[PDB]
Ligand binder design. Structure first.
Ligand SMILES: [Mg+2]
Ligand SMILES: [Mg+2]
Ligand SMILES: [Mg+2]
Lengths: 101, 75, 51, 49, 55, 50, 155, 87, 226, 141, 180, 143, 89, 295, 34
RNA sequence: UAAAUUAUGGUCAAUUGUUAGUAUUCAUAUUAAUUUUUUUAAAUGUUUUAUCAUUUUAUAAAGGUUUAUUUUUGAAAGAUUUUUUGUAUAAAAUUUUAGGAAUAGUUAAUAAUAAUUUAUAAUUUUGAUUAGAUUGUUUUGUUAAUGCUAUUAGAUGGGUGUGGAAAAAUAAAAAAAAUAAUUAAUAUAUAUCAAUAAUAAAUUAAAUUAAUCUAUUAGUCAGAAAUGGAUGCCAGCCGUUGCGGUAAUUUCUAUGCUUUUAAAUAU
């Protein structure tokens, strides 16, 4: 799904909706978690072939500790925004140096 | 400290490793310094260089040293 | 946040003969008792709970 | 239009130092944390579907 | 991106214009630094002012 | 100001403290001396001289 | 002193509010209240300090805090050249005047005398342009002859 | 006063603990005898801690939860926590 | 009723007669510090936080407060606090600027004494009159740069020696021979010849790899045997 | 001699020299000559705690003749207000009047020395009388 | 002027503006209830002290016997008292100079005190709201009408300067002969 | 009389010896230079440089080569620009177009308090770690 | 709020509010009668507002005059004391 | 060595109390710590301690915990309700008898001393322009002519100097509004504060005297100030140059001179000479002549 | 002296306070104290 | 280098823990607070209009900041009218950690320049920069007192940038363009604050409207009060010194006693 999303964004940024539609069809057929439901009909049925983005991507190891503690504290409410005082009392270290970078 | 280690704590990666400076072509400004834990002035005199007298520049030692003995006793 | 009266409430749900009462009532010199979570009867040859 | 549902109380107050109730506000959609969380932990061994 | 979003050198407001015409009626566009260049930089030295009759 | 109680209660001052008592009949009148003094922290007067 | 004196909530042991008005102009907090980002967590600072302790006006002559020797006055004495000692003859901390002070006068140097000093020597300028109760308080006193005459016996 | 004795209390005078083990310990001489010591376990801030305490509570039933209080000083060399009195 | 005892409190809704109605914030809370790091592995590299650290800007103990009764306020009638400052210009390397070191004063009521704290400022000057050593007077003004909001008003003391040295072409003041230490570890002078440069480099790299090995920890009493 | 050592003052050393001479039963004491020390000696002589004093016009020191009564000394204790010259203590008129008020009874037994803004070394009795507050120097009784 | 309006406590013309006199009081047991007449902006934040132009004074809505006064046989003077402490100078300054606004409860309190006429809210159900007719109003206007000069003089006295200087004061103030 | 160390010299303690020795201000300024142009007008608030330019004086210290080069380079700016814009308007117009579109495509085109903050990282520190990444240190200057 | 009668014009629109802002001519006439009573109270209110402003201005004038007199006396005394002290110095 | 130090004897309680003359509580009571936060809650709070700062009678509407509605609470007032010095101490009597009798003997405004409040020259110009604009007009159509004199008095009490421009504006506004007594009061304020009028101010006051019809005022004005006025001689310089050097302080006059001498607020008496620089005495002569004719 | 501040022993708190002592404050005469 | 007086003035400073050779503020008291005997919800439909729209409705908790948070009168108040006058983004000081070293789209000049100008740049051992902790300079508690010990809610990036001002995505004790209401203060469900609650703890009664309601006082060696039985360094007790070896004033238990009184216990 990560490379599918990156390729789809690159296609829509380079203005190739035909290739974007082909990628969407492939993803829908395969069953990728992100693109299981997203399926669209073919509109190019009669013609043959021939700063911008604001996002941040870092490897897993950067926030693996945050992920681990989030799932340890609240594994039943994934959308909880684990914060201070949930795992450490006042005037005490929270354990993880550099929360949210 | 950004080049070595992320925040610290890991032993051996808090203090910068040993830095060697060529006095003829200094790569730092104000080589000598005064600090409670960084007194390097005493480590730039005669007596510390006897350990590496087998490979050193006697001309540079003469040019820049402290309490240098007489040339006869040096020879 | 600390619950402390739970033991007092639980005391009412222990219907029967409690370990202390049975341990006090028994009056046999050949039956010895110990306690890890409650009073249990110890078998001499096994060195464990007399099942 | 199934809008008859009442406002959720999924956020639950937890007691903190001076009994000030801390509320776990749900994360906003415009962040990468949930995107990273939804992916499998071990891509090599965990199923991708 | 090189420095501050609004440099101090560019926060110039002109009082020679009417108060309410710069916001909506028009926008004055000029390089105001040239007239505020100091006498030390521009080499100007204040000579004694002569009266009109003697000038 | 309680430190200026004498000046506030003195009628010979144009800046004296002002009071209004609206009776149930609808007319307003000046407060009595007791009512005027009631708006200050109470103090005990005593003299052991005699 | 006692514990009750530490309760600044009382209006008896607290500096009055009008000091800030006297310092920054009459009716100055009306503008400050209208500030949008006020009280979160800060408001405009209030200069509520006793008039006899203001550092802007007072000096070593009539202020105790300006007579501190080792830091308030020792540096000044060193700068100005006055011979200074801890148990000095003068209150500030200088044993004697400096050479410049001794040699040169300072009466007519720095500023001409303000013309308003004539109020203390001429009684002719003492004016009260309006009566004491000219703003409608003429009837404040109920037993004054003025009020009695203006009202009448029936009133 | 000693403030490092109540390390495992973590401020609160009452610590809600579970029950895992109960053994006997000999108090410091010359006070000879056997005293019942409770090895108990609790969890605090998703961290499990185990401690040895004095089993002052008299047994009248089977219990899996206990309340740890600071208590006083005891002749037992190392334990510093008492069990809450039975109510 | 703060002055009333605990058992004397019949009610707590209002003050019946007068006084100060103050919240009874509980100071005796027994705050606890939880050790979350190894003794020699605290994440910070300079300052270690091993206990409850007192928080506050002015409420900390011992009490420290600003002291407006100093030399600058004794000399000047400042319209605003800290408007005017007298200091010596130290450092003239940026064009049309003059770095001035002015010392304010902080008072400790507990000890009932004051100390002076030195602060540096960037003072703007035209025609480049401020030379090293001048005793100058500076005042606040409009913002000029990111860190320039003071300007010189008068040069109380001219540095005649510095001006004469500049006229002769030499620097206004010889550079100091001692500076900030680049690193905590001492800096050893390198005197090796060209032939011995590689050997000295090898020795230095061996020392560095030994310092890296120090990360492993204490050497075991029993040597590793398989 | 060192930073940690207290910054001694002429008032402090004058007080300690007088106290030591009193404890050792001496007649004449040579004490440093400053305006504040001379004022303190004059006030003590006025109150009778000291038999007499003389300011020989020597820049360093002057002489004080002590007094004793019934074998013991008429001076019970002398203590300077501040040990360090860095710290300076100011005495408010209410803090001075609290000395006179002894649980409801007027008391002028213990003597306190203050120097006012007029360079006039007086005692707390006169300071209270004229309602002025100066910096304190010593307590003697 | 908000994407999501705070529907619980809306106001008019935004913030901050139009200082208004209200009666703030914490919701406590009624026997310990006491309000505070105070002038504040139209919009207030969580704590009322942020927007507080001036403080008018306390009001205790509890009828109390006059224990301070001696026990008098006067029937009207022995009725229950409802004490209210108010400020006059600040109230006049904010009402006239700054043209503030007032709420119904402070208006009723000030009407009781005599500072203001009775508020529009308080009305007697016995007397209905009357109606008007132009012809009858004109007939009354013709029946009685004040002189223009005297009406201008009274308007000037009420609105513009009223403390005038007469000829006696002018003669007293005029310079004396030596400097003439 | 070389300064002992840079750490002490920066805080202005090397020249503090003259202050402490009682010779803080004793130079007979009138003889060494004209004192009329070395002060400032309190009534107007204009600085010593303004007083000197009003009186026609110039108290300029001797200058090294680098500052003279800087002054010449900054002075030549208007003369170079006036002829460059006339002779080669193509590149100037291209740069003007780029700046015109850059003012639209930027951060905080409105001059609010956030954008007006002269020291943005120092003023807004709480968002310097998790919200922004452009700055690594919360302060960069003496203030 | 603004009262909306039940007998008003019904907006025959489903895409908006069910009632219009217009009104019956009787409603307009009766509104004028009610608005006439609003003007009776506010005119006295406005007049009382102006007279209070006048009273405050006059009191400020008199009190400020007295304060200016006293302050000028005090500052003249202070300046005379300062010049006497300067002569003694 | 590991033990701490112990005193040989106690420290004198009087000395210990006397050394506390500059404690933090004393500093707070003197008001040295400047306030920037909100402090305690004032209005509309459970602990809002504002309505208790002004005197009020005891509340006895109903049972307040001691059945105050039917109980003689003399002892209750003495032991609970009246504030104490501390827990268990004697009740703190805040009554008027505790305050000194000398508080009542002082005259009005004699407590306030003289203040030297100086500001930046830009701030002075801004304040002068704002006050001039307010004197000219304070509101759209509600500007009473009395408001001009009100703003003049506010400028006075704010420790400002009403320059000749301010005096001209105020006198002209009041004369145009037809209230000449107010203009006479402005002139009397100028006389009281010893602002020497310039020729333009003299002309404005003479216009006020002309419209009022009082010649004695012009008699006084001519005797006080117009005596030195002279016409322009053919040999004299007509456009006289600026003569008053702007205020400045040298090193000695900055270091040794006292603060009150160094302080400088814009005083119209300094620039009256520069405002009399154009020799407009003919207007003054004409106004005096027409004053005499009116009289 | 609160027990949680600085170390368990009181001399830790006293040593921590001694670094803020006005007489020992960092200056030219006393520098690099730590 | 002189005394005082036309006599208490100018308005209260006051410290209470039965120890245990000595050294050193460290066990047990009092006050304040937490703790047991079940006190103690943050409400769901804001409104008007010219109708698929427009007009009015601007700081709640989320994100961890110690050289740091600072600004408007263009809306409103606001008035015969037109018209006019002014601003303001900037500062200064106080800034935490047991074992302490480097920091960085970076300083200044120039300008509506420079991703690529010029310069011997700037921060810091007078403790910087990252990291940890904590919502900053009117709040408490204790004391005779220079101290010590507390305090709160809210300013966490932009990206068609509306608006006077972003504070703009549930959270009222805010009547918001017609007098809706003034006999109103009373307030029935889901997370939280003090309306949270302190009520003559046992003998002559409630000038009323009769409306809400139970818990063992703990000890008995030293030190208020203990005898008999059982145990015999065992079981146990313990603020403390310690007690239990066959007469135990310290355990268990019968009975009896004690209490300045409403608990006990801990932090
Ligand atoms: Mg602890
Ligand atoms: Mg941080
Ligand atoms: Mg025995």
């Amino acid at each position: 799904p990560t490379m599918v999303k990156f390729y789809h964004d690159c296609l829509v940024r380079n203005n190739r909706p035909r290739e974007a539609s082909s990628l969407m069809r492939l993803a829908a057929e395969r069953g990728v978690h992100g693109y299981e439901d997203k399926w669209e009909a073919d509109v190019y049925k009669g013609r043959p072939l021939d700063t911008e983005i604001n996002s941040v991507f870092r490897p897993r190891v950067y926030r693996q500790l945050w992920y681990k503690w989030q799932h340890i504290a609240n594994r039943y409410r994934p959308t909880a925004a684990l914060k201070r005082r949930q795992l450490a009392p006042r005037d005490s270290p929270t354990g993880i140096p550099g929360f949210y970078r | 400290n950004a080049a070595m280690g992320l925040y610290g704590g890991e032993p051996g990666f808090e203090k910068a490793h040993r830095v060697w400076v060529d006095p003829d072509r200094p790569h730092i400004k104000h080589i000598y310094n005064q600090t409670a834990l960084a007194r390097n002035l005493r480590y730039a005199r005669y007596g510390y260089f006897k350990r590496d007298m087998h490979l050193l520049d006697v001309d540079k030692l003469v040019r820049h040293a402290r309490l240098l003995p007489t040339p006869g006793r040096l020879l | 946040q600390i619950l402390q009266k739970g033991n007092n409430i639980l005391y009412s749900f222990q219907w029967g003969l409690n370990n202390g009462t049975v341990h006090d009532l028994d009056a046999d010199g050949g039956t010895d008792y110990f306690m890890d979570g409650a009073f249990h009867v110890r078998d001499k040859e096994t060195g464990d709970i007399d099942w | 239009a199934p809008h008859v549902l009442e406002k959720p109380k999924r956020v639950d107050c937890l007691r903190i130092h001076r009994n000030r109730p801390l509320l776990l506000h749900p994360m906003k959609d415009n962040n990468k944390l949930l995107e990273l969380s939804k992916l499998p932990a071990r891509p090599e061994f965990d199923s991708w579907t | 991106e090189r420095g501050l979003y609004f440099p101090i050198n560019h926060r110039i407001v002109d009082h020679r214009i009417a108060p309410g015409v710069t916001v909506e009626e028009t926008d004055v566009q000029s390089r105001y630094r040239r007239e505020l260049r100091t006498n030390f930089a521009t080499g100007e030295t204040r000579q004694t002012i002569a009266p009109p009759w003697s000038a | 100001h309680e430190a200026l109680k004498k000046l506030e209660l003195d009628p010979t001052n144009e800046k004296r403290r002002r009071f209004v008592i609206r009776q149930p009949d609808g007319t307003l009148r000046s407060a009595k001396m007791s009512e005027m003094r009631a708006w200050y922290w109470k103090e005990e007067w005593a003299d052991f001289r005699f | 002193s006692f514990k009750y004196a530490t309760k600044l909530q009382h209006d008896e042991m607290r500096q009055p509010y009008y000091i800030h008005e006297k310092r920054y102009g009459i009716f100055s907090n009306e503008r400050n209240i209208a500030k949008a980002r006020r009280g979160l967590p800060f408001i405009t600072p209030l200069y509520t300090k006793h008039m006899n302790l203001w550092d802007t006006d007072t000096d070593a002559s009539n202020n105790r805090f300006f007579r501190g020797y080792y830091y308030g006055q020792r540096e000044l004495h060193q700068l100005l050249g006055r011979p200074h000692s801890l148990e000095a003859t003068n209150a500030d901390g200088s044993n004697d005047l400096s050479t410049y002070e001794a040699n040169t006068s300072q009466l007519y140097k720095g500023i001409p005398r303000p013309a308003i000093t004539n109020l203390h020597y001429e009684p002719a300028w003492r004016y009260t342009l309006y009566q004491a109760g000219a703003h409608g308080a003429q009837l404040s006193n109920p037993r004054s002859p003025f009020t009695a005459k203006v009202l009448g016996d029936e009133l | 006063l000693f403030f490092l004795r109540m390390w495992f209390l973590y401020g609160c005078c009452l610590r809600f603990v579970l029950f895992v083990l109960c053994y006997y310990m000999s108090p410091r001489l010359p006070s000879s005898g056997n005293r019942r010591v409770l090895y108990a376990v609790f969890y605090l801030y998703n961290f499990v801690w185990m401690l040895r305490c004095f089993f002052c509570c008299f047994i009248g039933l089977v219990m899996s939860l206990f309340i740890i209080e600071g208590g006083g000083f005891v002749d037992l060399p190392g334990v510093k926590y008492y069990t809450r009195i039975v109510s | 009723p703060w002055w009333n005892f605990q058992t004397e409190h019949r009610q707590r809704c209002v003050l019946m007669y007068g006084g100060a109605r103050t919240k009874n914030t509980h100071n005796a809370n027994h705050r606890v510090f939880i050790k979350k790091y190894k003794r020699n592995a605290f994440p910070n590299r300079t300052r270690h936080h091993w206990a409850v650290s007192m928080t506050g800007v002015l409420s900390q103990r011992p009490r420290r407060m600003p002291w407006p009764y100093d030399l600058t306020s004794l000399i000047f009638n400042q319209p605003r606090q800290g408007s005017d400052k007298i200091g010596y210009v130290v450092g003239t390397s940026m064009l049309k600027t003059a770095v001035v070191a002015t010392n304010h004063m902080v008072y400790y009521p507990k000890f009932n004494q004051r100390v002076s704290r030195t602060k540096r400022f960037f003072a703007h000057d035209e025609d480049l009159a401020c030379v090293e050593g001048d005793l100058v007077h500076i005042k606040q003004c409009r913002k000029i740069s990111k860190y320039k909001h003071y300007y010189v008003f008068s040069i109380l003391e001219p540095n005649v020696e510095g001006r004469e040295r500049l006229k002769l072409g030499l620097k206004a003041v010889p550079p100091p021979l001692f500076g900030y230490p680049v690193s905590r570890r001492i800096v050893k002078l390198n005197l090796t010849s060209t032939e011995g440069t590689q050997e000295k480099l090898a020795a230095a790299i061996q020392e560095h790899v030994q310092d890296a090995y120090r990360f492993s920890g204490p050497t075991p009493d029993q040597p590793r045997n398989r | 001699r060192r930073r940690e050592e207290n910054l001694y003052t002429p008032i402090y050393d004058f007080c300690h020299r007088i106290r030591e001479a009193t404890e050792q039963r001496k007649r004449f004491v040579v004490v440093p000559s400053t305006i504040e020390t001379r004022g303190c000696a004059r006030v003590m002589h006025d109150h009778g705690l000291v038999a007499g004093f003389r300011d020989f016009h020597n820049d360093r020191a002057f002489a004080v003749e002590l007094k004793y009564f019934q074998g013991d000394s008429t001076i019970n204790v002398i203590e300077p207000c501040s040990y360090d010259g860095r710290t300076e203590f100011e005495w408010s008129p209410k803090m001075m009047r609290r000395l006179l008020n002894t649980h409801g009874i007027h008391n002028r037994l213990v003597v306190y020395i203050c120097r006012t803004a007029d360079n006039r070394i007086i005692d707390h009795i006169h300071a209270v009388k004229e309602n002025i507050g100066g910096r304190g120097l010593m307590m003697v009784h | 002027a908000r994407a999501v309006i705070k529907r619980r406590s809306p106001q008019l013309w935004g913030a901050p503006g139009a200082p208004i006199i209200r009666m703030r009081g914490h919701h406590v047991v009624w026997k310990f209830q006491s309000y505070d007449l105070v002038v504040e902006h139209t919009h207030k934040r969580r704590n009322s002290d942020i927007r507080l132009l001036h403080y008018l004074g306390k009001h205790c809505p509890h009828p109390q016997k006059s224990l301070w006064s001696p026990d008098t046989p006067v029937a009207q003077d022995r009725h229950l008292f409802m004490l209210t402490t108010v400020d006059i100078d600040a109230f006049k300054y904010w009402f006239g100079v700054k043209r503030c606004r007032l709420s119904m409860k402070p208006w009723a309190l000030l009407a009781k005190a005599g500072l203001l006429p009775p508020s529009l809210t308080q009305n007697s159900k016995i007397m209905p709201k009357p109606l008007f007719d132009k012809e009858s109003l004109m007939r009354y206007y013709l029946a009685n009408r004040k002189d223009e000069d005297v009406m201008a003089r009274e308007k000037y006295l009420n609105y513009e300067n009223s403390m005038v200087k007469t000829e006696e004061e002018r003669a007293a103030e005029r310079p004396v002969a030596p400097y003439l | 009389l070389q300064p002992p160390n840079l750490v002490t010299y920066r805080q202005g303690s090397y020249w503090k010896y003259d202050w402490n020795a009682g010779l803080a201000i004793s130079t007979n300024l009138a003889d060494v230079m004209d004192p009329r142009g070395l002060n400032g007008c309190v009534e107007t608030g204009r600085s010593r440089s303004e007083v000197a330019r009003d009186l026609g004086l110039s108290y300029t210290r001797p200058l090294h080569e680098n500052e003279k080069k800087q002054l010449s380079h900054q002075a030549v700016y208007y003369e170079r620009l006036a002829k460059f814009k006339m002779e080669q308007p193509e590149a100037a117009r291209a740069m003007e177009r780029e700046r015109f579109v850059r003012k639209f495509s930027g951060m905080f085109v409105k001059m609010d308090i956030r954008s007006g903050a002269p020291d943005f990282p120092s003023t807004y520190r709480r968002l310097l770690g998790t919200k922004v990444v452009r700055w690594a240190s919360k302060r960069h200057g003496p203030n | 709020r603004q009262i909306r009668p039940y007998y008003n014009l019904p907006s025959k629109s489903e895409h908006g509010r069910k009632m219009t802002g217009f009104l019956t001519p009787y409603r307009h006439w009766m509104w004028k009668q009610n608005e006439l009573w609003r003007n009776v109270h506010e005119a006295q209110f406005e007049h009382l507002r102006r007279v209070y402003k006048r009273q405050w201005l006059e009191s400020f004038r008199v009190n400020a005059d007295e304060y200016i007199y006293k302050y000028n006396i005090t500052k003249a005394a202070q300046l005379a004391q300062w010049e006497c002290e300067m002569k003694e110095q | 060595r590991s033990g701490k130090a112990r005193a040989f004897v106690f420290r004198d309680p009087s000395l210990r109390m006397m050394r506390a003359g500059s404690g933090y509580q004393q500093l707070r009571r003197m008001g040295m710590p400047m306030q920037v936060g909100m402090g305690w809650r004032k209005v509309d709070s459970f602990h809002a301690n504002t309505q208790y700062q002004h005197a009020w009678p005891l509340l006895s509407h109903d049972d307040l915990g001691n059945s105050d509605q039917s109980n003689n609470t003399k002892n209750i007032m003495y032991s609970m309700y009246m504030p104490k010095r501390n827990k268990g101490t004697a009740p703190w009597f805040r009554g008027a008898d505790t305050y000194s009798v000398k508080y009542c003997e002082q005259g009005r405004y004699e407590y306030q001393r003289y203040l030297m409040i100086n500001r930046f020259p830009s701030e002075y110009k801004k304040h002068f322009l704002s006050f001039l604009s307010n004197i000219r007009m304070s509101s759209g159509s509600a500007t009473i002519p009395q408001e001009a004199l009100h703003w003049l008095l506010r400028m006075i009490v704010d420790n400002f100097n009403p320059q000749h421009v301010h005096y001209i504006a105020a006198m002209k506004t009041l004369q145009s509004a037809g209230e000449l007594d107010m203009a006479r009061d402005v002139w009397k304020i100028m006389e009281r504060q010893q602002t020497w009028p310039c020729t333009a101010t003299i002309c404005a006051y003479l216009d006020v005297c002309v419209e009022a019809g009082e010649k004695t005022w012009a008699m006084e004005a001519w005797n006080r100030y117009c005596t030195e006025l002279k016409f322009l001689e053919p040999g004299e310089v007509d456009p006289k140059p600026i003569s008053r050097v702007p205020f400045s302080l040298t090193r000695e006059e900055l270091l040794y001179l006292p603060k009150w001498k160094k302080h400088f607020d814009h005083d119209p008496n300094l620039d009256v000479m520069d405002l009399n620089r154009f020799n407009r005495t003919r207007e003054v002569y004409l106004r005096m002549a027409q004053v005499m004719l009116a009289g | 002296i609160a027990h949680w501040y600085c170390g368990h022993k009181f001399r830790h708190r006293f040593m921590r306070d001694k670094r803020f002592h006005p007489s020992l404050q960092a200056s030219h005469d006393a520098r690099n104290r730590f």
